[PDB]
Amino acid sequence: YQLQPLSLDSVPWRRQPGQQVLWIGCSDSGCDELESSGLPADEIFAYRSLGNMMVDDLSCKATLGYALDSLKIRNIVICGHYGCHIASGEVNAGLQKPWSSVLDTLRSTHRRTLDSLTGTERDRALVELNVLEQVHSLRQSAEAAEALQKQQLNIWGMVYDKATKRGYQLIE
């Protein structure tokens, strides 16, 4: 995959004004990330969760369903953020399954990549890898797969950098 800086006036999830976007962000990020969204507040329907993840739970299924069925949303953005405390390091005792399982799988699946980086760069790669895995897994849901096959849904990944105050799209 590659990282492309967003231009706020041409974002892939706002090819036209006045539509709502489901924005999946992290609980230890904050409102600064939406300043990099290219979206006005009235176009943001935000689900803010542990590690900007969607897992196999009632909350994630009902939120996606409301967005697709009630709001007729055609764009989802999964926004990770550098410096995340959840998508970081090797372990966190207070983080339950399946959130902890998803991170453990990224750490094992990408052990070669992660081992070639040190500390801070390693956490940054985990944030990017989590965004890519969340986007891929959300496309593989029965409800998203049907919508994608009709060309009525796009799912996008980006990472917000609080140091540059910029978002970066994951192209891959």
Site residues, Zn ion (CB under 5 A): 26, 28, 84, 86
Q: What pairs with residue 160 in β-bridges?
A: 81, 167
Which x/- pattern over 96-135 shows residues binding a second copy (rule: CB under 8 A)? x-xx------------------------------------
Q: Residue 44: which H helix or E strand, with range?
A: strand 44-49
The tokens for 55 are: 């897992």
157 binds, among Zn ion, a second copy, none (CB under 5 to 8 A by kind): none
- Residue 156, C-beta contacts closer than 8 angstroms, at least 6 positions apart: 12, 13, 75, 76, 77, 78, 135, 169
Exactly one of 3, 55, 125, 148 binds a second copy (CB under 8 A); that residue is: 55
- Site for a second copy (CB under 8 A): how many residues? 37
Which residue, 162, 160, 163, is CA-closest to 38? 160
Scanning the structure block, which residue is given the tokens 């329907």? 45
48 binds a second copy (CB under 8 A): yes
5 binds, among Zn ion, a second copy, none (CB under 5 to 8 A by kind): none
Which residues, 57 to 96, sit near a second copy by CB under 8 A? Answer: 57-63, 65-66, 68-71, 86, 92-96
- Separation between Cα atoms, residue 42 and residue 106, nearest integer Å: 34
Q: Is 95 exposed, middle or buried (0-12, 13-18, 19+ CB in 10 A)?
A: middle
Exactly one of 19, 45, 110, 141 binds a second copy (CB under 8 A); that residue is: 45
The tokens for 46 are: 């935000």
Residues in contact with a second copy by the rule CB under 8 A:
25, 27-28, 30-32, 34, 41, 44-50, 55, 57-63, 65-66, 68-71, 86, 92-96, 98-99
